[PDB]
Amino acid sequence: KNTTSSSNENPILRWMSIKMNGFQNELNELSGHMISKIIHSQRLILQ
């Protein structure tokens, strides 16, 4: 139309871009703590 949308995809880019923030943030956080934990595994097993 566009609209793009009908709130609910513009305002569910409040979902979609922010579900992309839950996803990109999820990879961010798991990336962080996983990276530092494995860093504390070469610390914790090798070192």
Binding site: I39, Q42, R43, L46, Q47
Partner: protein, 48 residues
């Protein structure tokens, strides 16, 4: 240097704190290479 486990001596460790008593030596820390090393370090510390 070997601590190793004691209990010895006096307050059953009496030191037991023990952040290298003061360090982490927290270089930046930011330096995870670890070199696969070594002896630990003869280094004349063995000669010490």
């Amino acid at each position: 240097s070997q601590e190793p486990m004691l209990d010895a001596d006096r307050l059953r460790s009496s030191w037991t704190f023990s952040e290298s008593m003061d360090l982490n030596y927290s270089n930046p820390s930011s330096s995870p290479n670890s070199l696969g090393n070594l002896k630990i370090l003869l280094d004349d510390k063995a000669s010490k």
